[PDB]
Design a protein around this ligand. Structure first.
Ligand SMILES: *[C@@H]1O[C@H](CO)[C@@H](O[C@@H]2O[C@H](CO)[C@@H](O)[C@H](O)[C@H]2NC(C)=O)[C@H](O)[C@H]1NC(C)=O
Ligand SMILES: *[C@@H]1O[C@H](CO)[C@@H](O[C@@H]2O[C@H](CO)[C@@H](O)[C@H](O)[C@H]2NC(C)=O)[C@H](O)[C@H]1NC(C)=O
Ligand SMILES: *[C@@H]1O[C@H](CO)[C@@H](O)[C@H](O)[C@H]1NC(C)=O
Lengths: 57, 50
Protein backbone atom coordinates (compact mmCIF):
# COMPACT_ATOMS: atom_id res chain seq x y z
CA UNK A 1 0.00 0.00 0.00
CA UNK A 2 2.92 2.29 0.90
CA UNK A 3 6.61 1.33 1.22
CA UNK A 4 8.47 -1.61 -0.39
CA UNK A 5 8.81 -5.41 -0.11
CA UNK A 6 12.21 -6.26 1.36
CA UNK A 7 14.02 -9.41 2.50
CA UNK A 8 16.75 -10.12 5.05
CA UNK A 9 17.58 -13.29 2.99
CA UNK A 10 15.22 -15.75 4.81
CA UNK A 11 12.01 -13.71 5.40
CA UNK A 12 9.98 -11.08 3.49
CA UNK A 13 8.76 -7.85 5.13
CA UNK A 14 7.11 -4.67 3.89
CA UNK A 15 8.76 -1.44 5.07
CA UNK A 16 8.34 2.35 4.66
CA UNK A 17 10.68 3.92 2.05
CA UNK A 18 12.75 6.35 4.20
CA UNK A 19 13.37 4.41 7.47
CA UNK A 20 13.88 0.64 7.88
CA UNK A 21 10.94 -0.70 9.92
CA UNK A 22 10.08 -4.28 8.84
CA UNK A 23 6.42 -5.34 9.17
CA UNK A 24 4.85 -8.78 8.51
CA UNK A 25 3.27 -8.84 5.03
CA UNK A 26 -0.54 -8.79 5.32
CA UNK A 27 -3.83 -8.14 3.49
CA UNK A 28 -3.86 -4.84 5.50
CA UNK A 29 -0.34 -3.82 4.32
CA UNK A 30 -0.95 -4.84 0.66
CA UNK A 31 -3.49 -4.70 -2.19
CA UNK A 32 -4.16 -7.36 -4.87
CA UNK A 33 -4.10 -6.70 -8.59
CA UNK A 34 -4.34 -9.32 -11.36
CA UNK A 35 -2.18 -12.48 -11.11
CA UNK A 36 1.42 -13.83 -11.14
CA UNK A 37 1.70 -14.27 -14.97
CA UNK A 38 1.71 -10.50 -15.78
CA UNK A 39 4.50 -9.11 -13.51
CA UNK A 40 8.29 -9.19 -14.18
CA UNK A 41 10.30 -10.29 -11.09
CA UNK A 42 7.39 -11.16 -8.73
CA UNK A 43 8.39 -13.50 -5.81
CA UNK A 44 6.51 -16.30 -4.00
CA UNK A 45 5.71 -15.83 -0.28
CA UNK A 46 2.80 -16.23 2.17
CA UNK A 47 0.65 -13.18 3.00
CA UNK A 48 -0.88 -13.27 6.51
CA UNK A 49 -4.63 -12.44 6.57
CA UNK A 50 -5.32 -11.00 10.07
CA UNK A 51 -9.06 -11.86 10.01
CA UNK A 52 -8.41 -15.60 9.51
CA UNK A 53 -7.19 -16.81 12.98
CA UNK A 54 -9.99 -14.77 14.65
CA UNK A 55 -12.61 -16.68 12.58
CA UNK A 56 -10.70 -19.95 13.27
CA UNK A 57 -10.83 -19.16 17.04
CA UNK B 1 22.60 7.40 -3.17
CA UNK B 2 20.38 4.40 -2.32
CA UNK B 3 20.21 1.79 -5.10
CA UNK B 4 16.71 0.72 -6.22
CA UNK B 5 15.63 -1.39 -9.28
CA UNK B 6 14.48 0.89 -12.13
CA UNK B 7 11.00 -0.71 -12.40
CA UNK B 8 10.63 0.07 -8.63
CA UNK B 9 11.82 3.65 -9.04
CA UNK B 10 9.12 3.99 -11.72
CA UNK B 11 6.52 2.59 -9.29
CA UNK B 12 7.43 5.41 -6.85
CA UNK B 13 7.27 7.90 -9.78
CA UNK B 14 3.79 6.66 -10.88
CA UNK B 15 2.52 6.69 -7.28
CA UNK B 16 3.78 10.33 -7.08
CA UNK B 17 1.19 11.25 -9.83
CA UNK B 18 -1.65 9.26 -8.16
CA UNK B 19 -1.46 6.41 -10.76
CA UNK B 20 -1.53 3.23 -8.65
CA UNK B 21 1.77 1.35 -8.98
CA UNK B 22 0.27 -1.92 -10.36
CA UNK B 23 -0.54 0.17 -13.51
CA UNK B 24 3.25 0.24 -14.09
CA UNK B 25 3.89 -3.48 -13.52
CA UNK B 26 0.89 -4.61 -15.58
CA UNK B 27 2.15 -2.37 -18.47
CA UNK B 28 5.95 -2.43 -17.94
CA UNK B 29 6.89 -3.49 -21.52
CA UNK B 30 4.46 -0.94 -23.04
CA UNK B 31 5.86 1.84 -20.77
CA UNK B 32 9.44 0.82 -21.63
CA UNK B 33 8.69 0.76 -25.41
CA UNK B 34 6.94 4.17 -25.23
CA UNK B 35 9.96 5.62 -23.35
CA UNK B 36 12.57 4.05 -25.70
CA UNK B 37 10.63 5.26 -28.79
CA UNK B 38 10.22 8.77 -27.30
CA UNK B 39 14.04 9.02 -26.78
CA UNK B 40 14.30 7.86 -30.44
CA UNK B 41 12.06 10.78 -31.57
CA UNK B 42 14.41 13.21 -29.73
CA UNK B 43 17.42 11.93 -31.75
CA UNK B 44 15.48 12.46 -35.03
CA UNK B 45 14.06 15.84 -33.89
CA UNK B 46 17.52 17.19 -32.90
CA UNK B 47 19.20 15.68 -36.04
CA UNK B 48 16.64 17.27 -38.44
CA UNK B 49 15.41 20.46 -36.73
CA UNK B 50 18.33 22.94 -36.59
C1 LIG C 1 15.13 -12.47 9.14
O1 LIG C 1 14.16 -11.94 10.09
C2 LIG C 1 13.49 -12.95 10.95
C3 LIG C 1 12.59 -12.23 11.95
O2 LIG C 1 13.32 -11.14 12.54
C4 LIG C 1 14.55 -13.80 11.66
O3 LIG C 1 13.87 -14.98 12.23
C5 LIG C 1 13.92 -15.07 13.69
O4 LIG C 1 15.29 -15.33 14.13
C6 LIG C 1 15.44 -15.45 15.60
C7 LIG C 1 16.92 -15.61 15.93
O5 LIG C 1 17.63 -14.49 15.35
C8 LIG C 1 14.57 -16.63 16.08
O6 LIG C 1 14.62 -16.71 17.52
C9 LIG C 1 13.11 -16.42 15.67
O7 LIG C 1 12.33 -17.57 16.10
C10 LIG C 1 13.00 -16.23 14.15
N1 LIG C 1 11.61 -15.95 13.77
C11 LIG C 1 11.03 -16.51 12.71
C12 LIG C 1 9.62 -16.01 12.37
O8 LIG C 1 11.59 -17.36 12.03
C13 LIG C 1 15.62 -14.34 10.72
O9 LIG C 1 16.61 -15.02 11.53
C14 LIG C 1 16.25 -13.22 9.90
N2 LIG C 1 17.23 -13.77 8.96
C15 LIG C 1 18.43 -13.25 8.76
C16 LIG C 1 19.32 -14.00 7.76
O10 LIG C 1 18.81 -12.25 9.36
C1 LIG D 1 5.81 -19.75 -7.45
O1 LIG D 1 5.26 -21.00 -6.93
C2 LIG D 1 4.49 -21.77 -7.92
C3 LIG D 1 3.95 -23.02 -7.23
O2 LIG D 1 3.37 -22.64 -5.97
C4 LIG D 1 5.39 -22.10 -9.11
O3 LIG D 1 4.55 -22.68 -10.17
C5 LIG D 1 4.99 -23.97 -10.71
O4 LIG D 1 6.21 -23.78 -11.50
C6 LIG D 1 6.75 -25.01 -12.14
C7 LIG D 1 8.02 -24.63 -12.92
O5 LIG D 1 7.72 -23.60 -13.89
C8 LIG D 1 5.67 -25.66 -13.01
O6 LIG D 1 6.12 -26.96 -13.45
C9 LIG D 1 4.36 -25.87 -12.23
O7 LIG D 1 3.35 -26.42 -13.13
C10 LIG D 1 3.89 -24.55 -11.62
N1 LIG D 1 2.65 -24.75 -10.87
C11 LIG D 1 1.61 -23.91 -10.95
C12 LIG D 1 0.44 -24.20 -10.00
O8 LIG D 1 1.60 -22.97 -11.74
C13 LIG D 1 6.05 -20.84 -9.70
O9 LIG D 1 6.97 -21.23 -10.75
C14 LIG D 1 6.78 -20.04 -8.61
N2 LIG D 1 7.29 -18.78 -9.15
C15 LIG D 1 8.44 -18.24 -8.74
C16 LIG D 1 8.78 -16.86 -9.32
O10 LIG D 1 9.16 -18.80 -7.92
C1 LIG E 1 17.97 -10.08 -12.83
O1 LIG E 1 19.11 -10.28 -13.72
C2 LIG E 1 19.59 -11.68 -13.77
C3 LIG E 1 20.83 -11.73 -14.66
O2 LIG E 1 21.74 -10.71 -14.22
C4 LIG E 1 18.44 -12.57 -14.25
O3 LIG E 1 18.86 -13.95 -14.20
C5 LIG E 1 17.21 -12.41 -13.35
O4 LIG E 1 16.12 -13.24 -13.85
C6 LIG E 1 16.77 -10.94 -13.29
N1 LIG E 1 15.66 -10.77 -12.36
C7 LIG E 1 14.77 -9.79 -12.50
C8 LIG E 1 13.80 -9.61 -11.33
O5 LIG E 1 14.75 -9.07 -13.49
Amino acid sequence: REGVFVSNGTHWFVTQRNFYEPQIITTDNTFVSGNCDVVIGIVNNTVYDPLQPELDS
Amino acid sequence: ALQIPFAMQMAYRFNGIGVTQNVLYENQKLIANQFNSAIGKIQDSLSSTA
